[PDB]
């Protein structure tokens, strides 16, 4: 478990995914997407089986956030290769991405560029839909540690004001 967590942390972070998804071809991107789908499905099942609760909560959420940042960054570039690659990779990985609803909203906003029409644009549209259709995601299980609890309290106060 120790060495496994260390290896996965060295792979996820260090900013390798972003360029390695630029370099490879289409089918190579599909394959790497399948690999990430498998590893994340197994990790999430391990988490939801309660086995990892001590500190794996914070580290797992950090991994999810770093992967979300990397994809949101690479998905925004002018080239054609990066766009087609990101589209294929997400078309593979989006099947299991029950992260915080904030993350799904962030990916939906980043994919909602809708620039001049093309083939990439036609492909991006079904990849902006069929992922917002999740709309079932958990956000409380993450943590309350940081001052973010105060921001949640302020948002709750704003919602209470709205209720009137």
């Amino acid at each position: 478990t120790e060495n496994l967590m260390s290896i996965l942390n060295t792979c996820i972070t260090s900013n390798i995914l972003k360029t390695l998804l630029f370099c490879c071809t289409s089918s190579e991107a599909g394959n790497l997407g399948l690999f990430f789908t498998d590893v994340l499905k197994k990790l999430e099942k391990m988490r939801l089986n309660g086995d990892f609760n001590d500190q794996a909560s914070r580290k797992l959420y950090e991994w999810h956030s770093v992967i979300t940042e990397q994809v949101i960054d690479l998905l925004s570039e002018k080239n054609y290769m990066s766009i087609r690659n990101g589209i294929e990779f997400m078309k593979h990985v989006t099947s299991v991405f029950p992260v915080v609803k904030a993350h799904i909203q962030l990916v939906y906003t980043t994919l909602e560029e809708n620039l001049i029409n093309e083939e990439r644009e036609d492909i991006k549209l079904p990849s902006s839909a069929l992922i917002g259709h999740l709309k079932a995601r958990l956000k409380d299980a993450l943590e309350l540690d940081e001052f973010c609890t105060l921001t949640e309290e302020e948002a709750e106060q704003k919602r209470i004001r709205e209720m009137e």
Partner: peptide, 28 residues
């Protein structure tokens, strides 16, 4: 395209020295 070819060729030797690319000329 030149960056694409150089990257395809360097994927085996020095993978972890890839953060420097960042949609720009190969940072040596």
């Amino acid at each position: 395209i030149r960056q694409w070819q150089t990257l395809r060729f360097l994927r085996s030797r020095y993978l972890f020295d890839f953060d420097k690319v960042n949609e720009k000329t190969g940072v040596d």
